[PDB]
């Protein structure tokens, strides 16, 4: 018979199955619609999540209770050194979908991106692309023919780029390689742009700017095997219930004589691909700026790095993106930042952010000081200083 | 964090502050008002037998006398001796409003202090005589 009291079901059936992701780098499932009138532009970028900190923002939002007032907000820092363009891929349209027609690589690749092709780098003879590089000799026939094929037949053009992971504090030396779609002029213009940008770097301020809404695509933090109570949010059974209280009391009481796919079960939690949208960029910081952590209100000469560095990550020595709130994934994980798939129609997409203060206290404890000079000034002279 | 401290210093089980008690003891009118309280049916001892230092009601005058002949009361009386430690002291220690802190300290040393001491002495002799 019918359930006496209505209640929404536990969990979202559209995020099934709750299995481990296939790769640590989350796939970009959709790119913004291409407009042939616009100039050539990349549709996404790669970064490494460093950590989180706190800001104070001077809010300009008409109609809000916090209009012309200060708000304290949490932000996420993504280390974004420039990426390197190493290839181009052409895609044609078929009754069975998009199909890759051909790929053209640059003549010279670095060891950072060569390591992506090896499971045992230190024992290998490092022969990858050594015969491909010989096709650039005597005017580059073959390379020219494949570029002409992409110009003649492709409907989508993607550029193959890789991260400069040596600039990060990461212990990993193997770089991450990804396809980024080119949205801009004609197919020939995209191919010419990619060819002229082979072996060249693209910085993050040549893809995004301040006050823009972006999407974060990443694999969430893993948690291993988990029970139903924390995997799905079910209510705990009463105390000393037989065979356990962290369960669902009745997984089935009705005719089908099966366990339904819609019933909560214990299993893997975390390490799933996730795409969250509409994260506002608060700052695009340059790595060569001595005071990229300072504002017009806060005159302290300091960088974005907190005292002692980011916990489990290290210092920020390159360009960075400061977006508000939180993004999926944990610290030091590779993340993909995507352009918005539509023209956002909210006023928060048009707001201009002015920051009054950036927190740089230590994240390794109850940090009270923004700089070591401030800490020394407050404490005074220690026994070892004299 | 531990259960003893949690269940003693819960916010709903909080006690009156030392600076408030010092302000109560500083002025003679406040001491007279606290000594002559209206009869309240919700208080122990009908609002009578009130120790001002500890800010505590007793059920009987004999209970108040035993409380006065005790180390807990002596501990509170010793605590209520010096500067009351308001926020100005911490500000001065940080280096903020130092002149205001110095003016407050010299006012306590000159005017408020001895008057509070004389009020305490009169209260002590009154309690000794009546009890």
């Amino acid at each position: 018979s019918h359930r006496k009291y209505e209640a929404p079901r536990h969990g979202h059936l559209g995020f099934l199955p709750r299995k481990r992701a296939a790769s640590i780098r989350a796939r970009v499932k959709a790119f913004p619609k291409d407009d042939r009138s616009k100039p050539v532009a990349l549709t996404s970028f790669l970064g490494y999540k460093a950590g989180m900190t706190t800001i104070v923002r001077d809010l300009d939002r008409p109609g809000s209770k916090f209009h012309k007032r200060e708000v304290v907000e949490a932000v996420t820092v993504v280390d974004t050194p420039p990426v390197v363009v190493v290839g181009v891929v052409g895609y044609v349209e078929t009754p069975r979908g998009l199909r890759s027609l051909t790929t053209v690589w640059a003549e010279h690749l670095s060891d950072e991106v060569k390591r992506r092709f090896y499971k045992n780098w230190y024992k290998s003879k490092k022969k990858a692309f050594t015969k491909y590089s010989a096709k650039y000799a005597q005017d580059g026939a073959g390379i020219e023919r494949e570029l002409a094929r992409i110009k003649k037949y492709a409907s989508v053009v993607r550029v193959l780029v890789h991260t400069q992971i040596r600039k990060t504090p990461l212990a990993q030396k193997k770089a991450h390689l990804a396809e980024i779609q080119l949205n801009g002029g004609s197919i020939s213009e995209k191919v010419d742009w990619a060819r002229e940008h082979f072996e060249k770097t693209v910085a993050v301020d040549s893809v995004f700017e301040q006050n823009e809404m972006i999407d974060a695509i990443a694999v969430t933090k893993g948690h291993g095997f988990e029970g139903v109570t924390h995997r799905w949010g079910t209510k705990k059974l009463p105390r000393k219930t037989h065979r356990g209280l962290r369960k669902v009391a009745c997984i089935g009481a009705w005719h089908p004589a099966h366990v339904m796919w819609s019933v909560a079960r214990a299993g893997q939690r975390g390490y799933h691909s996730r795409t969250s949208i509409n994260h506002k960029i608060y700052r695009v910081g340059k790595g060569d700026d001595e005071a990229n952590g300072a504002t017009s209100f806060d005159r302290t000469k300091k960088t974005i790095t907190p005292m002692g560095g980011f916990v489990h990550y290290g210092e920020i020595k390159n360009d960075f993106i400061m977006v508000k709130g939180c993004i999926p994934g944990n610290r030091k994980r590779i993340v993909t930042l995507r352009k918005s798939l539509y023209t956002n129609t909210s006023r928060k997409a048009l707001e201009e952010v002015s920051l009054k203060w950036i927190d740089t206290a230590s994240k390794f404890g109850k940090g009270r000081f923004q700089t070591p000079a401030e800490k020394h000034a407050f404490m005074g002279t220690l026994k070892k200083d004299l | 964090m531990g259960r003893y401290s949690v269940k003693r210093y819960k916010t709903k089980r909080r006690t009156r502050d030392l600076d408030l008690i010092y302000n109560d003891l500083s002025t003679k009118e406040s001491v007279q008002k606290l000594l002559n309280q209206p009869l309240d049916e919700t208080k122990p001892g009908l609002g009578q037998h009130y120790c001002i230092h500890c800010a505590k009601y007793m059920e009987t005058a004999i209970a108040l006398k035993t409380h006065l002949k005790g180390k807990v009361h002596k501990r509170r009386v010793k605590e209520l001796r010096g500067v009351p430690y308001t926020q100005e002291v911490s500000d001065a220690a940080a280096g903020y409003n130092l002149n205001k802190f110095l003016n407050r300290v010299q006012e306590i040393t000159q005017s408020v202090g001895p008057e509070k001491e004389s009020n305490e002495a009169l209260l002590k002799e009154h309690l000794d005589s009546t009890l």
């Binding site: 009291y5 209505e6 209640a7 104070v56 916090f66 200060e70 304290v72 | 916010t11």
Partner: protein
Amino acid sequence: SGNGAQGTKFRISLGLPVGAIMNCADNSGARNLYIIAVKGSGSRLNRLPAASLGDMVMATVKKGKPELRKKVMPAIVVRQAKSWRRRDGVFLYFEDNAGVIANPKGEMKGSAITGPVGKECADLWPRVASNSGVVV
């Protein structure tokens, strides 16, 4: 967000579920208020309706005048002991939970409020701000 409240209300940590008892901060004769319902509360299985600072509740007077007791009246929460975050950048809390008796239009029965009043409640309700002597 209630009738008589001035404007929208941003979310505050909930401190007072149904069944809680808070002090009465006005001078109408009540000593404490016993919460029986929360105005504008949501619907969810097993979840208790809970009040926060600036919320209107339905309360019965447990201690106070006999004529004042044995009836249900609207009240406005003006102090809570559960810490809540101000958007200026601090978490804060009071010593006690306290409210005042009002009408469905948000007008005070008494003429004055004793003790501090939260800025959120005072800015939300114009009559509380008119009768408040101490606002934070």
